[PDB]
Amino acid sequence: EALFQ
Amino acid sequence: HHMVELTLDPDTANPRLILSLDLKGVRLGERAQDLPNHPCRFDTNTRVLASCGFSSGRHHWEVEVGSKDGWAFGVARESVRRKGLTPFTPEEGVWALQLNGGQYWAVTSPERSPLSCGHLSRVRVALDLEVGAVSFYAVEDMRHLYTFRVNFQERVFPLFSVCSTGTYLRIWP
């Protein structure tokens, strides 16, 4: 979900 | 209160991010902009820096935060990796708060530190390059959210990331 944060 | 005047640096921004015209605001779009791929540009992680960094002294700014998941903000060392998918961790030189899973986190590693701070609207960031610390306070009462104590060994930049639609970050002043 936040992989690309 | 003397705060630094910051603008988001479009040359650093992931091409999926949309920056407001005043360069204070950032959210995620679903269209990648056709932008030149500079070495400074985050090509995979949904990050942008301010155009101003700091090598010394004490600096304050505020960040207005969306109520829904997808944001993280704080500071990054200038050497933060820009290319390919990178971890969002202190080891990678990012020192941030995050709203994810409807919980506020200080982004410690290997596990994030859940914050029981109540709802956030706006956060004051206190960057201290003289002692080596970055602190976050909720502006209503300046309750302390988190402090990262770091022996910063390079220039430090305000950092913003938005990895889902339906939320935003905005710089004040």
Contact across the interface for B44 and A2, Cβ inside 8 Å? no
Distance CA B72, CA B49 (A): 12
Contact across the interface for A3 and B85, Cβ inside 8 Å? yes
SS3 state at B102 = coil
Would you kindly state where each structural domain of chain B is located, as residue ranges?
10-172
Distance CA B23, CA B170 (A): 9
Distance CA A5, CA B70 (A): 8
Q: B172 with B123: CB under 8 angstroms?
A: no
User: Domain B10-172, what architecture?
Assistant: Sandwich (2.60)
Is B167's Cβ below 8 Å from some Cβ in A?
no
Helices H / strands E in chain B, number of each: 0, 13
CA distances from B21 to B7, B8, B26 (A): 10, 10, 10
**Which own/partner pairs from B130-137 qualify as long-range (CB within 8 Å, at least 24 positions apart)?**
B130/B56, B130/B57, B130/B58, B134/B74, B134/B75, B134/B95, B136/B74, B136/B97, B136/B106
Closest Cα to residue B157, out of B72, B56, B57, B76? B76
Distance CA B25, CA B71 (A): 12
Nearest Cα of chain A lies from the Cα of B133 at a distance, in angstroms, of: 22
Contact across the interface for A5 and B161, Cβ inside 8 Å? yes
Sheet holding B103-106, edge to edge: B47-49, B156-162, B71-77, B94-100, B103-106, B113-115
Nearest Cα of chain B lies from the Cα of A1 at a distance, in angstroms, of: 8
Nearest Cα of chain B lies from the Cα of A3 at a distance, in angstroms, of: 8
**Structural method:** X-ray
| CB within 8 Å of B166: residues ≥ 6 apart | B66, B68, B69, B70
Phi/psi of residue B110, nearest 5 degrees: -70, -20
Q: B152 with B132: CB under 8 angstroms?
A: yes
User: What is the Cβ-side half-sphere exposure of residue B11, based on CA atoms within 13 angstroms?
Assistant: 5
Phi/psi of residue B170, nearest 5 degrees: -145, 130
Size of chain B in residues: 173
